Request: fold
Amino acid sequence: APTATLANGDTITGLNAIINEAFLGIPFAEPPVGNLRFKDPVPYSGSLDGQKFTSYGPSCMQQNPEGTYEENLPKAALDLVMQSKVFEAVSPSSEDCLTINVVRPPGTKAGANLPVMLWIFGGGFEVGGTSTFPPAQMITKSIAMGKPIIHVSVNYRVSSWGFLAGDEIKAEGSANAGLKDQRLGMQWVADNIAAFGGDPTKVTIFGESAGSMSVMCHILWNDGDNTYKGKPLFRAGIMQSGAMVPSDAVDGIYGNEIFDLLASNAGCGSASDKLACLRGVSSDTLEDATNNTPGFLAYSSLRLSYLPRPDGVNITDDMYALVREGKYANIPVIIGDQNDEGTFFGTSSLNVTTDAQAREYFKQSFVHASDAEIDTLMTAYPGDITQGSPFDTGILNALTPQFKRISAVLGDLGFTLARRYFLNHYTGGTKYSFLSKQLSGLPVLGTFHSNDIVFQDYLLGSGSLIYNNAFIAFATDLDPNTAGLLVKWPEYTSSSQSGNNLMMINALGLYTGKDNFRTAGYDALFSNPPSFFV
Ligand SMILES: *[C@H]1O[C@H](CO)[C@@H](O[C@@H]2O[C@H](CO)[C@@H](O)[C@H](O)[C@H]2NC(C)=O)[C@H](O)[C@H]1NC(C)=O
Ligand SMILES: *[C@@H]1O[C@H](CO)[C@@H](O)[C@H](O)[C@H]1NC(C)=O
Ligand SMILES: [Ca+2]
Ligand SMILES: [Ca+2]
Reply:
């Protein structure tokens, strides 16, 4: 029943789910297959007239989270699962995966001009799909609030398929294919969203974790120019756990190391042109070769095998430098974190039990760090188990003498303190920040990484007041305070400002606090950011 006429005249049919209308699996680019592998996406040319879009398309190829060149049980276990016909049945994946989804309130018609929330999923830049992020909770809530919004989600290439790097990739100008897929998705929204009832000038981009870092990348894309056909692609952004990516250039050391390993794994180690050889292997071969490179749950943890890297063209330089240099789009933003962002990643190195092994693990993870810098880090983040994450849990959660320490470090560099650095240098627009402690007391993990996804798409909780209501108000009025919350959300100007500047969330509800914790780690970590890039 639900129908829409795209900008090229094609008329498409959606699915009436009653609580909302959906248009799932719309292709926005040609299959990045064959010789199009690793290359910039190409706008879809085919006609869609008369076609129905009532179900999510396949996700892009996924990399085993426990993938690694080594051989262990976790890897073998996940592999066994991810290759089962049952798994490929419930969660299909393919290289032909560049589709987009539009879900709106029931009865919404063309010209409605409702604000648009364009979701970018996160998954360590190695796994992920749009189908596992239900928009119903957000949509229904926005309606009950009298601020109906349209939910748009875009698939993009992950892992070796979307973030392959190295000298060859750089020379080709094919860096950051995954981010480019997202960018094309945004342009597709600009040209066609009006047909679904959305207002292209009211697009707010939001994502969590890898999706959150993606949002940051879009703010810094092309040195800040986020225009398309003379108009901005988005008027605001919401970053849920993830700011700048601490990475070396695309043709850096680890970028090349990984590219060579992958090529060897695929049997292209003797090709004079390794890139063309990789475009020649079958899907299976590439999938297998990729699963033999470190995944995000493997020992390498945060030192990701695949992720956004400055290319000198679309991301002109060091990302922390781009922010200091003011090379970004000027939009209002909301950026927050979960209290214990790093506990998940800390479970990947439970073989590290002594300070000496901890120091060694850090030296391996951050190759640019000098011994002095490492000593400083280990002083800012002491062995004292009562001081690590899960924070404020005393002697509890001591899986090892180093677990809470490694969890704290990884959590801060990758997300929590990285956020403060951005907030302390960004003058692009009004800034709002939150810190969730909604799950204080949860054994081992605490208020863990990605728990907000549950309270935003699956279950209702104190945090839903922020992940839903506040976010909907922001996308609608550009001020979270129009949501009508009992606690006023203060504006963030500086981590050094007096008065509360953080919206806080506990199990009972909301309150405000200050972004002034672990200042020693902040300095030890960001005096010279590049010393800790991967
Ligand atoms: C704890 O486990 C990790 C994971 O295997 C060990 O790291 C690997 O060690 C082997 C043997 O030397 C190497 O071949 C691999 O290259 C290492 N993996 C990576 C990605 O570095 C680590 O040495 C162990 N640490 C301690 C303190 O026992
Ligand atoms: C990549 O950067 C170049 C440099 O100007 C630009 O021409 C091109 O449009 C950029 N690609 C995208 C997706 O914006
Ligand atoms: Ca090489
Ligand atoms: Ca500027």
Q: What stands out?
A: DSSP finds 18 helices and 15 strands in the chain. Residues 70, 299-300, 351-352, 357 surround ligand 1 (CB under 6 Å). Residues 1-534 form a domain with the Rossmann fold fold (CATH 3.40.50.1820).
